[PDB]
Each structure stands twice: as structure tokens, then as C-alpha cells.
Ligand binder design. Structure first.
Ligand SMILES: Brc1ccnc2ncccc12
Ligand SMILES: Brc1ccnc2ncccc12
Length: 119
């Protein structure tokens, strides 16, 4: 019932995500010189370095907030892709599956710990 445990669990999951080749297009903000129309489609850019920095700055209060930003990385890729067969979009789907598989216990344990705190 450790209410703080999610933070290190999220740091470790972000480390695994950075080791993965599929995260390379998402490690830093999308390069606007490479994709000049990006901000015409995407209102809120997000990337894994921004997530890691927000976490390290102590600017996430819960793993739900981190999970919303990570999910925004994937929804931005789905919105920007010209095709469901695109290389970078296909990488985002594999990364999303891996993230969701691993974040589920982090969220469950955190929510359980908060319920125990108010039992
Ligand atoms: Br990194 C990563 C991303 C996507 N799928 C993965 N599957 C297994 C292990 C690491 C993975
Ligand atoms: Br092309 C493409 C497809 C999907 N997501 C993308 N995100 C960033 C840069 C290029 C992308």
C-alpha cells in the first residue's frame, strides 16, 4: 500500500521504453523542420523526454497524469499519420501495447494504496 511507489515504477518503465527501438521517433519532440505541418494537426505535442522530465521535476501528482501524457504521444501519432500502414505509426502501436501491458499494475497498485489510506 505504498502511495509513492508508482514514481520509481514509472521511471523504470520509461527506461524500458527508451531501450526499445520502437520509441526512437518519440524520444524527443517531433521535429517541426522535418514535419512542417505538424502543429496544423497536433494541438498538444508530447514526447517521452518531456514525460521523463515532468516526472523528475516532481510535476506529476499521480501515475494517471503520467499515463494521460503517454497516451497523448500515441494519439498524436494516430492523428498525424497519413496511413494506418505508416512506419512511425506502426512503431507507436507496438510501443502503446507494451506500455499498457506494464502500466496496468502501476495504476492498480496506486489506486489500491490510496483506497487503503482512506479505509
Ligand atoms: Br521497448 C518495447 C516496445 C514494444 N514492444 C516490446 N516488447 C517486448 C519488450 C520490449 C518492448
Ligand atoms: Br509519418 C508519422 C506517422 C505517425 N506519427 C508520426 N509522428 C511523428 C512524425 C511522423 C509521424
Amino acid at each position: 500500500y505504498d502511495i509513492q511507489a508508482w514514481k520509481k515504477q514509472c521511471e523504470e518503465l520509461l527506461n524500458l521504453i527508451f531501450q526499445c527501438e520502437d520509441s526512437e521517433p518519440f524520444r524527443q519532440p517531433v521535429d517541426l523542420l522535418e514535419y512542417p505541418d505538424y502543429r496544423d494537426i497536433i494541438d498538444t505535442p508530447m514526447d517521452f523526454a518531456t514525460v521523463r522530465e515532468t516526472l523528475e521535476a516532481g510535476n506529476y501528482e499521480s501515475p494517471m497524469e503520467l499515463c494521460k501524457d503517454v497516451r497523448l504521444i500515441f494519439s498524436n501519432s494516430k492523428a498525424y499519420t497519413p496511413s494506418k500502414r505508416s512506419r512511425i505509426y506502426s512503431m507507436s502501436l507496438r510501443l502503446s501495447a507494451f506500455f499498457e501491458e506494464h502500466i496496468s499494475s502501476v495504476l492498480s497498485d496506486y489506486k489500491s494504496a490510496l483506497r487503503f489510506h482512506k479505509r
